[PDB]
């Protein structure tokens, strides 16, 4: 699994609408390319992907 280092949140814009009304971009530093899981450990937010 591609390792991730220096993970950082930066919410571009948040609007607590009924649908997915908030976009956050994560800046990281990986070693290779691929796919792997994402999730919000807390409950106040629910990810689309």
């Amino acid at each position: 699994a591609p390792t991730i280092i220096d993970l950082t949140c930066t919410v571009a814009t948040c609007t607590h609408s009924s649908d997915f009304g908030g976009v956050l971009t994560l800046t990281y530093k990986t070693n290779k390319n691929g796919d792997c899981s994402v999730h919000s450990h807390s409950n106040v937010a629910t990810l689309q992907e």
């Binding site: 814009t13 609007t15 009304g21 976009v23």
Partner: protein, 48 residues
């Protein structure tokens, strides 16, 4: 002969004057409030 200065040459705010449908055009005075109703199709989704 003695008409004097017409309004075409002393109208305030640079208002040009046309006669036939007597009117003052390009009067640069005041503010125009604008209320606009838009369909959501015009906007763009944040996710996009």
């Amino acid at each position: 002969k003695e008409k004097g200065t017409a309004l075409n040459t002393k109208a305030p705010f640079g208002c040009q004057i046309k006669t036939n449908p007597v009117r003052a055009m390009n009067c640069a005075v005041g503010n125009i409030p604008v209320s606009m109703n838009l369909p959501d199709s015009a906007f763009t989704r944040i996710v996009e």
